[PDB]
Amino acid sequence: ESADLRALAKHLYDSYIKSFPLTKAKARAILTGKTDKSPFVIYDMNSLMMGEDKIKFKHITSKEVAIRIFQGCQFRSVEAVQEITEYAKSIPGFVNLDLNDQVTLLKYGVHEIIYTMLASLMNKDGVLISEGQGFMTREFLKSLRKPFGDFMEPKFEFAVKFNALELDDSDLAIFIAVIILSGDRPGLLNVKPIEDIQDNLLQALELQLKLNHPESSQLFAKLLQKMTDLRQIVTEHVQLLQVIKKTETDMSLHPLLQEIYKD
Amino acid sequence: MESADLRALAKHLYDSYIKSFPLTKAKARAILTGKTTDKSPFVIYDMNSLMMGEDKIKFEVAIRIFQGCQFRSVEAVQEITEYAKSIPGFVNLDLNDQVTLLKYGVHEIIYTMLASLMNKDGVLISEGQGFMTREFLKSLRKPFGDFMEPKFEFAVKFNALELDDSDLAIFIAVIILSGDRPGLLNVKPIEDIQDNLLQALELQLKLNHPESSQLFAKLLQKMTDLRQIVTEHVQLLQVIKKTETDMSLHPLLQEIYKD
Ligand SMILES: O=C(O)c1ccc(-c2nn(C(=O)c3c(Cl)cccc3C(F)(F)F)c3ccc(Cl)cc23)cc1OCc1ccccc1
Ligand SMILES: O=C(O)c1ccc(-c2nn(C(=O)c3c(Cl)cccc3C(F)(F)F)c3ccc(Cl)cc23)cc1OCc1ccccc1
Numbered sequence: 458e459s460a461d462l463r464a465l466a467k468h469l470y471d472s473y474i475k476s477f478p479l480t481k482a483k484a485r486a487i488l489t490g491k492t493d494k495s496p497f498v499i500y501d502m503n504s505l506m507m508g509e510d511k512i513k514f515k516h517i518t519s520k521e522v523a524i525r526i527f528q529g530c531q532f533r534s535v536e537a538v539q540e541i542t543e544y545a546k547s548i549p550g551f552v553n554l555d556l557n558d559q560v561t562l563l564k565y566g567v568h569e570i571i572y573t574m575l576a577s578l579m580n581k582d583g584v585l586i587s588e589g590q591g592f593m594t595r596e597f598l599k600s601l602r603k604p605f606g607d608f609m610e611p612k613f614e615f616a617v618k619f620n621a622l623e624l625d626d627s628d629l630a631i632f633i634a635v636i637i638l639s640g641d642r643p644g645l646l647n648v649k650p651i652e653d654i655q656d657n658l659l660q661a662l663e664l665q666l667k668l669n670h671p672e673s674s675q676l677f678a679k680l681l682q683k684m685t686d687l688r689q690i691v692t693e694h695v696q697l698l699q700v701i702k703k704t705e706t707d708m709s710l711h712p713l714l715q716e717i718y719k720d
Numbered sequence: 721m722e723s724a725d726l727r728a729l730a731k732h733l734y735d736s737y738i739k740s741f742p743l744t745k746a747k748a749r750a751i752l753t754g755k756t757t758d759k760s761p762f763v764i765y766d767m768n769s770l771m772m773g774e775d776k777i778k779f780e781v782a783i784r785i786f787q788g789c790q791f792r793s794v795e796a797v798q799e800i801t802e803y804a805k806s807i808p809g810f811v812n813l814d815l816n817d818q819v820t821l822l823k824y825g826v827h828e829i830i831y832t833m834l835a836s837l838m839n840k841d842g843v844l845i846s847e848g849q850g851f852m853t854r855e856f857l858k859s860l861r862k863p864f865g866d867f868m869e870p871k872f873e874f875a876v877k878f879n880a881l882e883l884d885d886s887d888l889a890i891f892i893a894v895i896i897l898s899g900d901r902p903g904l905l906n907v908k909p910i911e912d913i914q915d916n917l918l919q920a921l922e923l924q925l926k927l928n929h930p931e932s933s934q935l936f937a938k939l940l941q942k943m944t945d946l947r948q949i950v951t952e953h954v955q956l957l958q959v960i961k962k963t964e965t966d967m968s969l970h971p972l973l974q975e976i977y978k979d
Contacts, residue, residue: 659934675918681940682900688944 462661465549466631469661472547473630476540478588481577481626487589488580496585499593512591518714519707523605526598527701528710531718537574538567538720541633548634550654558645564720565642568694569687570633576616577629584613604704608697615690619683622676628669631662632680636687721919729808729920730890736806737889740799743847744885745836751848752839761844761851777850782864783967785857786960788845794970796833797826800892807893809913817910820903823976825896827953828946832892835875843872863963867956874949878942881935887928890921891939895946 474480487496499508502522509517516529542563545551551559578585583594598609624632638655640648666676702708710718738744751759764773773779779788801822805811810818837844842853857868883891897914899907925935954977960967969977 656934659937663937675915678918678922678936678940681937682943684941685944685947686900689947692948 458660459664462657462664465657465661466627466665469548469630469634470627472544473626473633476544476547477574478540479578479585481624481629484578484585484589487585487592496590496592498583499586499591500597505597508591512587514587514591519709521707523601523603524705524707526601527605527608534571535717535720537571538563541567541570541637544633545637548637548654548658550650550657551637554650555647558647558651561642561644562637562639562651566637566639567720568691569636569684572612572615572687572690572694573619573633573636574629575612576619579613579616579620581613581617604697604701608701611690611693615686618686622680622683623670623673624680625669628662628665631658631665634658635662636684721916723923726916726920726923729916730886730924733807733889733893733920734886736803737885737892740803740806741833742799743837743844745883745888746885748836748844748848751844752851759848761849763842763851763853764845765853765856773850777846779846779850780966782860782862783964785852785860786864786867787967790970790973792845793830794972796830797822797972797976800826800829800896803892804896807896807913807917809909810897813909814905817904817906820901821896821898821910824901825898826976827950828895828943829892831871831874831946831949832878832888832895834871835878836888838872838875838879840872840876863956863960867960870949870952874945877945881939881942882929882932883939884928887921887924890917890924893917894921895943 486492487494497504497508497512499505505522505526508514514529516525516532519525519528545559545563551562554562575584578589581595583592583596584598585591586593595610595613599606599613601609635655635658638651638658640652640655645651662680663677666673666680670676750756751761754760762769762773762776764770767781770781804818804822804825810821813821834843837848840854842851842857844850845852854869854872858865858872860868894914894917897910897917899911899914904910921939922936925932925939929935957977
């Protein structure tokens with residue numbers, strides 16, 4: 458079944474490339490400076506104002522900067538959820554699961570996958586925006602006022618550690634599939650076929666990492682250990698959103714917009 | 721990194737685990753499953769049978785049981801510390817990192833090893849001479865009842881893997897040698913030791929559970945559930961501290977929980 462796992466790896470890679478707008482391979486070329494197309498840099502309040510007049514960043518509807526950026530992260534996350542939902546359908550076996558378990562697996566997986574894939578857009582100095590056309594500095598995000606500064610920095614701290622593994626897109630395509638097919642999500646009705654699919658994906662990821670990183674000792678194990686850190690930081694993440702809700706009375710969104718963002 | 725060396729490391733760790741921990745999973749399972757006259761535990765299921773139990777096993781009620789667990793936890797810390805010293809390379813690490821690895825490792829290991837003493841109905845106590853029912857523990861008053869039950873929820877799931885003692889010996893070693901503990905000074909020599917231990921665990925699980933697909937991955941995923949439950953534990957212990965001044969902690973546990 459060696460050729461079967463490679464077929465599964467290639468299938469997921471092809472789908473991952475079609476599902477997501479900015480791949481890791483492309484994002485790294487932008488971040489490192491390796492075919493022109495130099496991104497607009499947002500490093501302070503003035504260059505943010507000019508950036509939405511030039512890039513027209515899809516986040517301009519509160520007048521306060523820190524809130525507008527925070528809500529920007531929400532808008533992009535809602536888009537990522539739909540992209541991840543579309544990608545999940547290409548995982549062999551997923552659409553044949555009970556419909557409620559599909560919803561459940563997506564509901565509890567999307568946060569871990571967004572964190573994971575956000576690392577692809579990050580280095581220690583900042584993050585790509587607008588499909589790589591802009592670059593927002595870490596220092597500017599970290600220095601946002603009151604809770605917002607400390608809301609952004611944990612994402613960078615995770616990404617820097619996760620990126621030391623040096624996964625590429627063909628590695629990440631299987632890893633993301635493994636996260637989705639987690640048989641311990643609360644409320645699953647039929648755990649057995651989810652775990653059976655995840656076992657196939659784990660075999661595929663194990664073989665992929667040996668062939669693509671033959672010199673990287675116990676990388677498979679190290680990546681599974683990261684699925685630990687993910688459960689933890691997603692939990693911290695949610696407890697940070699709750700504090701913003703109870704503290705900040707300037708989060709006035711139209712009730713309909715609030716409904717779009719409810720998750 | 722080569723097979724005979726990985727098998728040699730597995731045998732070393734199992735041999736040392738048997739020397740360090742007096743009540744193995746193999747012994748606990750023989751006691752739990754029964755059909756043996758000689759190894760039958762006295763069963764504590766209510767207040768009256770607890771009273772008779774201290775006359776037989778020589779083992780406020782909720783406090784006395786909590787205090788019972790602390791005493792055994794301190795002994796467990798001692799046993800785990802002794803085992804850690806046998807892990808090749810551990811004592812050669814920077815002394816501050818040895819402390820750090822134990823500080824954050826003992827709790828995850830106690831939980832792991834407590835599963836060996838448990839089934840869905842209760843837990844062995846007093847080196848297997850007693851068995852305290854889950855329902856009795858769960859029904860202890862105020863915060864103490866809900867303090868015991870998460871251990872059982874984990875053990876039922878962990879025990880579904882059907883690991884034996886030779887498996888757990890390497891798994892416990894992998895937990896201790898975690899390079900992501902806060903405050904470590906030299907991550908690299910710890911990660912090199914864990915890499916050998918992970919190679920050793922991977923091969924051990926393939927040879928000992930050849931029909932158990934991706935058991936390695938499933939066991940590493942369990943180190944997730946451990947990290948979470950240790951967190952819930954300390955958050956419950958903190959609430960007990962604010963309510964109960966009629967109890968103190970052993971200085972060893974006290975230092976372990978500081979930060
Ligand atoms: O383009 C992308 O793929 C992209 C995806 C996510 C983010 C982003 N989310 N986020 C979350 O707090 C989050 C996560 Cl992690 C998970 C679930 C839900 C949320 C949220 F709460 F938002 F609903 C961030 C926090 C800090 C920074 Cl730095 C970026 C993000 C950004 C993306 O693209 C880069 C970007 C950066 C700023 C604004 C817009 C886009
Ligand atoms: O014999 C053993 O090896 C053994 C070890 C641990 C426990 C046990 N600890 N505990 C902790 O709340 C704990 C932990 Cl996990 C870690 C650190 C500190 C503490 C504490 F809070 F105490 F400071 C429990 C909670 C519920 C149950 Cl069910 C058992 C335990 C029991 C052991 O043996 C079985 C046993 C059970 C009751 C009494 C005596 C012995």
